[PDB]
């Protein structure tokens, strides 16, 4: 259906309005998942054709995420296309093994994504953040001028 009337998040706003790792948001960090580990096997790739994965790693790591993260991300892909026809959801970081995120980042568990719109139009990111809240991410933070960070609770 038609684009929605939305209230965007402000730069550096997060929703819910509590720290990411608290119970009301995404909950605690449970430990890095390394490629070589048994827990790595519970991550599966998101191959949704309506999402762009940056994949600067050329490894497909950005596609790996928990099912809870995948379901929210997929809902979000639909609402982005409906909000701005001709524009898609883009993921810059999904699960990570490059190691630039703060220690205890939910990226290391496949429980977070950093996203933009596919046109990199920063005027849309506050609205993109509101759609991520509406898509059911357990925490959404307009973290940087460069991207919005979204995460989920542990399965």
């Amino acid at each position: 259906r038609p684009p929605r009337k939305l209230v965007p998040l402000a730069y550096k706003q997060f929703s819910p309005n509590v720290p990411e790792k608290t119970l009301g948001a995404s909950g605690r960090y449970e430990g890095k998942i390394a490629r070589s580990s048994e827990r790595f096997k519970e991550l599966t790739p998101n191959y949704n054709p309506d999402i762009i994965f940056k994949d600067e790693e050329n490894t497909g790591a950005d596609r790996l995420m928990t099912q809870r993260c995948k379901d929210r991300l997929n809902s979000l892909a639909i609402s982005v296309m409906n909000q701005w026809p001709g524009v898609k959801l883009r993921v810059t970081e999904g699960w990570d093994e490059d190691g630039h995120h703060s220690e205890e980042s939910l990226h290391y568990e496949g429980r977070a994504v950093d996203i933009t719109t596919s046109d990199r139009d920063r005027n849309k990111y506050g609205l993109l953040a509101r759609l991520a809240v509406e898509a059911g991410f357990d925490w959404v933070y307009y973290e940087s001028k460069a991207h919005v960070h979204c995460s989920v609770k542990s399965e």
């Binding site: 762009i52 940056k54 994949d55 600067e56 790693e57 050329n58 810059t92 970081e93 093994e97 490059d98 190691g99 630039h100 933009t116 990199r120 940087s144 001028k145 460069a146 991207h147």
Partner: protein
């Protein structure tokens, strides 16, 4: 006779609004001890997903840190590196993402 395994980038941090410093480990043994002429450091704004947009600095083989300069303020970059010799280039390292500082 190219090196195969690349360096691993351990840290990237903004020095100021136009400059980012990275540090890396490279253990020559990982390539049987093969000798390297230096490292290539590649960096591209994170808004680009075109591999053609990486710019390249060269540093010498004894260096394990480098400051990339003449970057844009408050801008995220993708940063990866290789070691090389006459035989060719290693695999790329891990790819870091790091923003310069906002303008003072």
């Amino acid at each position: 006779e190219r090196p195969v395994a690349g360096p691993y980038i351990t840290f990237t941090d903004a020095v100021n609004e136009t400059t980012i410093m990275l540090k890396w480990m490279y253990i020559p043994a990982s390539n049987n001890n093969t000798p390297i002429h230096g490292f290539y450091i590649y960096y591209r704004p994170t808004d680009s997903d075109n591999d053609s947009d990486y710019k390249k600095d060269m540093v010498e083989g004894d260096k394990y840190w480098h400051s990339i300069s003449h970057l844009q303020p408050e801008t995220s970059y993708d940063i990866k590196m290789q070691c090389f010799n006459e035989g060719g280039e290693s695999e790329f390292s891990n790819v870091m993402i790091c923003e310069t500082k906002a303008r003072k």
